[PDB]
Amino acid sequence: TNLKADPEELFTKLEKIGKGSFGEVFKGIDNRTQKVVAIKIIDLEEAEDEIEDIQQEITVLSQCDSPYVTKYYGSYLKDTKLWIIMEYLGGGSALDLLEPGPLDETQIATILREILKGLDYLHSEKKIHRDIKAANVLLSEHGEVKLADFGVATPFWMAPEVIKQSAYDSKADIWSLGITAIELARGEPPHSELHPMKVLFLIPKNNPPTLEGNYSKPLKEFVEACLNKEPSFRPTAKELLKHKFILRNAKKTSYLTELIDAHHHHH
Ligand SMILES: CNc1ncc2cc(-c3cc(F)c(-c4cccc(C)n4)cc3F)c(=O)n(CCCCN)c2n1
């Protein structure tokens, strides 16, 4: 965290583009390179109880160096406000790209494959993402797919062992990936109609969700593989990258620009 430099001289703050954990996010311009950045501004007096979680997320992102993880450029403190500078991804989130209509299985498989490449990287680095969901998967304007917003070390994407506060590992991300697969196929996670407190006991109580609808058997089996109540029965990210659903359906990420365009024309 840079304490002398004035982020308001270094960056031009433009329109709001989201609301993440602990503050609002803006499109911005790096005034020296003219590159577009994403800027989160957190007021450290209003978000005092969460400062350690913010620091922890910055530390983790600063240790990542992967095409599949959104880049962290640095942070600045001006008066009471912490500016966090991230890579800007102009395709938006995968959740956004669900708005014009359903994804086809090639789009689903391509997005899941790239998420798996990010998880393979993190898990190989002995890291856990902890908040895999379509809202936290960002696309560049070229169709590149990257992970954003790590969870701190809403219940719909949480593995049962995470809810039961059991010691969990990277297989919790594999469960969340299975929920995200359903969300990419159907538009919403399981139980999305229910009150979160009900979901909190339904996830440990119920059999795991399945993907319902006219979807290929390999996609249903991909979901089933991820959504096993027993974490040791969930495959690794490495293994899921070789799953038949991925191998038979995933294509070049550049094809996802058609998905981004469809979202542009829908608005
Ligand atoms: C539309 N294109 C686009 N491109 C890039 C980003 C980056 C981020 C972003 C990610 C982060 F991990 C942190 C971060 C890092 C360390 C600590 C903390 C507390 N936060 C900050 C961020 F601003 C972001 O929010 N959006 C908004 C959508 C969020 C979806 N969930 C972006 N939107």
Swiss-Prot record:
Recorded superkingdom: Eukaryota
Binding positions for Mg(2+)?
A: 136, 149
Catalytic residues in the record:
131 (proton acceptor)
Q: What would changing residue 40 to A do, according to UniProt?
A: Loss of activity and autophosphorylation
Residue span(s) of domain Protein kinase: 11-246
Q: Which residues bind ATP?
A: 17-25, 40, 87-89
Where is the motif (Bipartite nuclear localization signal)?
238-252
Q: Name the chain's protein.
A: Serine/threonine-protein kinase 24 36 kDa subunit
Q: Which organism is it from?
A: Homo sapiens
- Write the gene name: STK24
Q: Which residues of the full protein are shown?
A: 26 to 301 of 443
